[PDB]
Amino acid sequence: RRVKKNIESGIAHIRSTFNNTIVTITDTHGNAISWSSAGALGFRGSRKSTPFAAQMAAETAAKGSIEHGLKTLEVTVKGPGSGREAAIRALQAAGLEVTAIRDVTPVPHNGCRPPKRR
RNA sequence: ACUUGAGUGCAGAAGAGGAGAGUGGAAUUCCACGUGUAGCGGUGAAAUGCGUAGAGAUGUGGAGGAACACCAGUGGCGAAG
């Protein structure tokens, strides 16, 4: 309701950040399965960055990936943040065979300067 | 008059020394379309701002500018900047 498609493969980006962290449980191509993140955790502001936000974000979004039912799907980290461990153990240690671990902190080789500090 | 000073020669070595042309990627923005929903964002805590006109994220492709990570180090070069 509507589309009940179920597939095995997929790589759901778990991109922790400074403020919050969204785990978009995407497809191997692909399309987004469960676009649920730490904002689905109703705690907003300071409590929306703790490691309980990691375990809760993987709880809801992993519940969605159980809704699509794909058994084997790895995870990846993007952006230097403070929830990566709860994303790892909550993601692969949510009860699946998630065993891929990449590093997608976009370290720009050249690039524009960031804002003044701070 | 003479040769170490200083210069020429001969052979080596080295460098982000300079000027002009061309090329290459990583990253950000923006745009087009797929996928998807209700948050994204920021903070000391929030709000302004963005988002159901479909955002964030994710996939693909295109345009453009600026700076070149790793080597890289109280390393090198320059009269100094």
CB atoms within 10 A of CB A87: 26
Q: Which nucleotide is nearest to A49 (CA to C1')?
A: B43
Which residues on adjacent β-strands are paired with residue A102?
Answer: A76
CB atoms within 10 A of CB A104: 12
User: What's this structure's resolution in Å?
Assistant: 3.8
Cis peptide leading into A30, omega within 30 of 0?
Answer: yes
- A18 Cβ within 7 A of any nucleic strand B atom: yes
Provide the residue type at A49 as one letter: S
- A31 Cβ within 7 A of any nucleic strand B atom: yes
- A65 Cβ within 7 A of any nucleic strand B atom: no
Q: Do A74 and A87 contact (CB within 8 A), yes or no?
A: no
Closest CA to A28 of A10, A14, A46: A10
Q: What contacts A87, CB < 8 A, 6 or more positions away?
A: A14, A16, A21, A23, A54, A57, A58, A75, A77
Q: Which residue is closest to B47 in terms of CA–C1' distance?
A: A45
Interatomic separation, CA of residue A48 and C1' of nucleotide B55, rounded (Å) = 19
d(CA A46, CA A34): 24
Closest CA to A87 of A63, A62, A107: A62
* Distance (Å) of CA A60 to CA A25, A27, A39, A53, A86: 11, 17, 10, 10, 13
User: What positions of strand B are covered by protein, i.e. any atom < 7 Å from a CB?
Assistant: 24-28, 34-47, 55-59, 65-70
Which residues on adjacent β-strands are paired with residue A35?
Answer: A24
Method: cryo-EM
Q: Which nucleotide is nearest to A30 (CA to C1')?
A: B59
Take residue A74 and report the two structure tokens written for it: 């790895």
